[PDB]
Amino acid sequence: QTGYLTIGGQRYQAEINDLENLGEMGSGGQVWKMRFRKTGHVIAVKQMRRSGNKEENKRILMDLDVVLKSHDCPYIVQCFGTFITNTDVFIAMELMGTCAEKLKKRMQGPIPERILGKMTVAIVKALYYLKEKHGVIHRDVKPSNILLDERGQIKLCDFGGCAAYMAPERIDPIRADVWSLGISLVELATGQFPYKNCKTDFEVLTKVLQEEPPLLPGHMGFSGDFQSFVKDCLTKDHRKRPKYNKLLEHSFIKRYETLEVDVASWFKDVMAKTRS
Ligand SMILES: *CCC(=O)N1CCC[C@@H](n2nc(-c3cn(CC(F)(F)c4ccccc4)nn3)c3c(N)ncnc32)C1
């Protein structure tokens, strides 16, 4: 069914004319920020043009399919509804604040372990949900796919790859997403991408295979649980890399499943800082 917006359990009949375009978000894919004139809600809207590339449109529809089926996972960006016009398809998504990549750039430094713990719990459960309930492999985990908002939520988006986060077995032939998560955790925890000064994508792949896993430093106060979780994620031999069932029992996951962390206040403090 299309032509309806469902925000907070309230289904509203709506058409494309009921949305006010507040401008494109980011650059490079065209995601608008729009306002629902009937309630005042602000939402993210993905526009798929009928005259667009048949390859990108085919990918958007399959990714929309997974998104529409993930309505029961709280760690995946939710779809509020769709609009199908004669020349376009508009996909309405819940509006988040920004991604972890832009949080890193705005922080201009490492991201605290407390925040990365809640992020690790959310992303692993999002990946385990996609695998167990839908048989979907993400195949592209990176900081630009991890969204946060003012309310402290951390959710996964844009699944359906980037060579910088590719696992060793994907480079030189299930658990491949575990490796990409560990690289993302090192990058966010240190503020530096672990494979530095690589001028080409191939140079990154050579360092992935030839060099030892880039684990967390020992002089930054990281807890033993965090260093252990990253070391487990960055297992180069994909046959010894833990399943999602094993990762969900890791003490790092168990700690931040129950620990109270004010991600909302931390998010607002970082956004209040200025880069321009
Ligand atoms: C690192 C973050 C970043 O630079 N950007 C660029 C501008 C758009 C930002 N953004 N994206 C979403 C978002 C994206 N989706 C997925 C989709 F809707 F595009 C899609 C659905 C179905 C099939 C294919 C694609 N959902 N949300 C953002 C949200 N939701 N809030 C705030 N900013 C978002 C990320």
Numbering used by the authors: 118 to 145, 148 to 279, 295 to 307, 317 to 419
Show me the paper's own sentences about this structure.
The direct activators of JNKs are the MAP2Ks MKK7 and MKK4.29 Targeting upstream kinases of MKK4/7 has been met with limited success due to possible activator redundancy, whereas targeting JNK itself has not shown clinical success yet, perhaps due to on-target toxicity. Thus, we considered the protein kinase MKK7, which exclusively phosphorylates JNK (whereas MKK4 also cross-talks with the p38 pathway) would be a prime target for selective JNK pathway inhibition. We have previously developed selective acrylamide inhibitors for MKK7 and set out to use them as starting points for optimization. We successfully determined six novel MKK7-ligand complexes with three members of each series: 1a, 1h, 1k and 2a, 2b, 2c.
